[PDB]
């Protein structure tokens, strides 16, 4: 009975969706995400799990703000406006 | 040969820069030389094709033919001539795509800016 008839009773989730990473790794009774670590202020990760790091580092998403720091740096963090010219 | 440290002979880097050039850059790669006539006339060898220019095909199968440029199809690195087309089996008609380096410019469409360009290259006008 340990095989398939037991599998018939598999209809309750141990994890739902994680707010911080959206992964369906938020263990309900434990109230913590098995992937990202939420609600722990820090983010879960480990040096023995490189591929996982790779799967989640900076650059694997939008970079809504960091994107632009280097242009900005390149120009000395100029402020103001650009004037005019001709042609 | 190359002599500067900010220029690359690398073939890989070249082809990339070609094929992924932005529209603004393709404007200049799409340059046709002027006609022997126009070249004396303006003292200046080539210009980036613009639309309503008048042009002569001097290469390939349509060699000899002439017309007004109808679009610079920058996306395709190709220029269509309003007058040079494929008629079909179903008699529908279709632009042939031509390459600026295989044309010669025969009348320029002129702007303030076009003239400004020609001057900037140290050329002269009529």
């Amino acid at each position: 009975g340990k095989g398939t008839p037991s599998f018939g009773k598999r209809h309750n989730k141990s994890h739902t969706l994680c707010n911080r990473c959206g992964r369906r790794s938020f263990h309900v009774q434990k109230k913590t995400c098995s992937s990202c670590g939420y609600p722990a202020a820090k983010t879960r990760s480990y040096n023995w799990g490189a591929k996982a790091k790779r799967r989640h580092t900076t650059g694997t998403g939008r970079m809504r703000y960091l994107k632009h720091v280097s242009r900005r740096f390149k120009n000395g963090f100029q402020t103001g406006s650009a004037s005019k010219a001709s042609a | 040969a190359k002599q500067s440290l900010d220029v690359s002979s690398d073939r890989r880097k070249a082809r990339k820069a070609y094929f992924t050039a932005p529209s603004s850059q393709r404007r200049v790669l799409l340059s046709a030389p002027l006609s022997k006539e126009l070249r004396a006339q303006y003292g200046i060898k080539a210009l980036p094709i613009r639309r309503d220019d008048e042009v002569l095909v001097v290469r390939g199968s349509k060699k000899g033919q002439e017309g007004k440029i109808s679009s610079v199809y920058r996306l395709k690195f190709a220029v269509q001539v309003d007058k040079v087309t494929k008629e079909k089996v179903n008699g529908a008609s279709v632009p042939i795509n031509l390459h600026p380096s295989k044309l010669v410019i025969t009348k320029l469409h002129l702007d303030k800016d076009r003239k400004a360009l020609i001057q900037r290259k140290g050329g002269k006008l009529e």
Binding site: V69, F73, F77, T79 | -
Partner: protein, 119 residues
Amino acid sequence: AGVKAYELRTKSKEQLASQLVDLKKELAELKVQKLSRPSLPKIKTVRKSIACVLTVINEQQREAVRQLYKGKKYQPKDLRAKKTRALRRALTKFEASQVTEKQRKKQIAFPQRKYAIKA
């Protein structure tokens, strides 16, 4: 068409608020039509236009506040320079260039001389 910002910036505060309403009415009516017509690109330009009006309105109100804070300690955090978080807390040049009483006396009396070898 599409309204131009350099012409918006000459309207009064209150003119722009109404052109914004005018635009919004149009966009309302445009979407009503959109679902009768097979295509309706005109809508794009009316809704870029709304952007532009808002852009110009926020622009002017900002420019106002900016000035009436210009040249005092303490101005709203979003008119302060952004720079970088660290840059933001680096020592000011005055703070950095700060030199000890004892030290400037030294710098003064014995400063690195310019000299040369030959004769």
